């Protein structure tokens, strides 16, 4: 309930994706792969802007590949799909980082916006490790997002 309607929307979409595969826990990989979808999201433009080699379109789709195959390495859980798998402790750490980053950006003064959520998820070690072997840099795309936020 501490998220904006768009952040909550993408979070429950990731939850639905996790329940489809019955893969134990809603890892940050699920929510990040959900970010890769929904082309209106800032993630696509950030990824194309960050890497000059990423200007090639299909390479961006390979990111989903680098998630999908990684998502193929998760043993499934013996539970009914009509339930919310317990979000991992790494996911909670990511959400707390998102809340903290939102807090530190307004010293004068909490619903987390989409972009901070994306930055926090990219901060996750597993997502960054997935992106690294795909030639993508999580720090680079985070910096690109944060610079674009200033506009």
């Amino acid at each position: 309930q501490t998220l904006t309607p768009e952040a909550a929307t993408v979070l429950n979409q990731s939850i639905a994706e996790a329940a489809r595969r019955n893969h134990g826990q809603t890892t940050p990989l699920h929510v990040a792969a959900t970010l890769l979808a929904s082309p209106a999201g800032f993630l696509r433009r950030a990824c194309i802007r960050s890497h000059p080699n990423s200007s090639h379109p299909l390479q961006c789709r390979a990111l989903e590949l680098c998630f999908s195959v990684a998502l193929e390495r998760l043993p499934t859980a013996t539970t009914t799909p009509g339930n919310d798998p317990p979000i991992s402790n790494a996911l909670m750490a990511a959400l707390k980082r998102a809340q903290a980053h939102q807090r530190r950006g307004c010293p004068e003064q909490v619903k987390v916006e989409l972009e901070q959520l994306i930055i926090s998820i990219l901060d996750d070690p597993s997502v960054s490790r997935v992106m690294r072997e795909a030639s993508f840099s999580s720090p680079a795309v985070k910096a690109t997002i944060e610079q674009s936020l200033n506009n």
Binding site: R104, P107, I119, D123, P125, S128, R132, S137, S138, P139, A140, K142, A143, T144, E146, Q147
Partner: protein, 641 residues
Amino acid sequence: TALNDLPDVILSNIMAGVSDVRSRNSASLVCHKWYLLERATRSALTLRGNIRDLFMLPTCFQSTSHLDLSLISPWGHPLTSAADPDSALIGHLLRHAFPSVTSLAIYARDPSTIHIVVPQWPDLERLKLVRWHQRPQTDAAGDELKLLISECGTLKSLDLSSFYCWTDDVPAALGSCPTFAANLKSLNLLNSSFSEGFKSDEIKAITKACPNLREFRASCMFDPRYIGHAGDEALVSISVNCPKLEILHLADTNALSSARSDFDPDEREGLGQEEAKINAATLIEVFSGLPLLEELALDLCNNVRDSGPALEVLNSKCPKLKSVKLGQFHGISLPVESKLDGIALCQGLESLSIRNVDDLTDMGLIAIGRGCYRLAKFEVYGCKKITVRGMRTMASLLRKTLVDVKIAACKKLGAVQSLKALEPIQDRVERLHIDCDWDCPDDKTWARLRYVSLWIFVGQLLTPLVAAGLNDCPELEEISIKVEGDCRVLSRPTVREFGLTTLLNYPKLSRMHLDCGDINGYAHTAPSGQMDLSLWERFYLIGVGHLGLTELNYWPPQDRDVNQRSLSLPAAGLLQECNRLRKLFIHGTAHEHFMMFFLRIEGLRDVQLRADYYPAPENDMSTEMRADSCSRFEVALNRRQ
């Protein structure tokens, strides 16, 4: 009970006690809990990497409060350049990787680097700027320093002791914003790279802009031959404008040189040896205006005579005084009969550094030792009249507290005489400096000696050191050797090697500084029948592989005319034989072929070429260093397994 079962609060407390970076890295590999504790506990980080892969920066160091970006490879490379629009991203990058930075050290090669990186942390409290390269041209004075003044800034400490700039840049920047200058609680301008020190007007403006300075260090010009030299008026203005000073370090630029030929009055061709514009009454007024002073340093390259009354006033007017460093202050101790006077009345001193006192005699040393009975560190330089008897008696007087002694440039006190003088404190002294002078005419366990500093003239041998008296040092761990002189006039040494194998006498020796940077010779071409610097590097580095050194700092000798400090083939070959090396820092230049010699050392981790001298090589064209060579060397060293 096991450690893992303890509450996490005391686990954080115990992990915070581990300041060794290597052991912290080891501890982070124990388990997940240990990894989290180490990552959330680490407070200081010195970044190690290349500019190219800065976007491979880890984000696990979210709790570091002190960040040092001055050692990013290539050393001195511009961290941020206006030629690349993406350089701004670097700012954000750093701001996102280390959000809790309160102290920052950064190599400020270009103004854009400052303007983009420094304002990232509004809570920044301490800032250190490093630049040994040339000053970029700006429209006015202090334009690059004006970039420090951020809106949400609260900078309290500014350190420019390694930041080369014009002395007009500091007052220009400090006068552009009263709030920034008023918030400063410390200001370090003690830079030896200034061509000439701060003028009198510049000192007045700096002090007037910063009325809240608790610490003030500056490289000033006291030579009266120049126009605008700092004198009595500047000191009085310092005392008036900054009544809260606790540390005051004023030195002539030449007094900060590494080479003794630049500040020693005897080794200068008649330079110095003339009175400065400093009176005893002026010093009395200055000391009266500074009640909170705790550390004082007046290291001048011009004489200040009959300064005894001022130092007597120091004791009564500065009760908190603990450390005094004097340069060419004469009449400091002139005892008559048995009454103490001068610095001998400052009974509260804990350390005292003395340089170039003509009046000082054995009785002066006796008076200093008898009066300053709390003295723990004593340094004397260039006193021609003191002898072994006075120094030995002074050491006996201070036997209960004196643990750090430096005896340099004393004509009647050589190596043997210094070691005989320090006999009463032989089992208590911890740090020791002597001059390796073997030509001075006229139960032995250094139980707690831990650090030895040696100065020796070029072409002399190290072998007599053991015979000098420094024989049994079970706890000696680090030795620093500095060699100075002009070898363009010397012939080839008759003895093949300098004698580093002598240091095999000390079983616990593991760290060394071999500073040959103040040797002037011929780099790649000698006129005729002369020897280049490679011969001397071989002479000095033979046997360095036999020592079990784990850390080594090497300063290659320089060719002053060509302004190069290149590593030579014998130097690289001999450093290659040090198998047990862990850290190797070379303060010069070396091309790729010689740098690749160091890959044979299996345990070598920290290798870098640090040209921390002025002027540093400006670009890859002017020297044999290339950015690609450094990057390839780093990649080859990290991938070693």
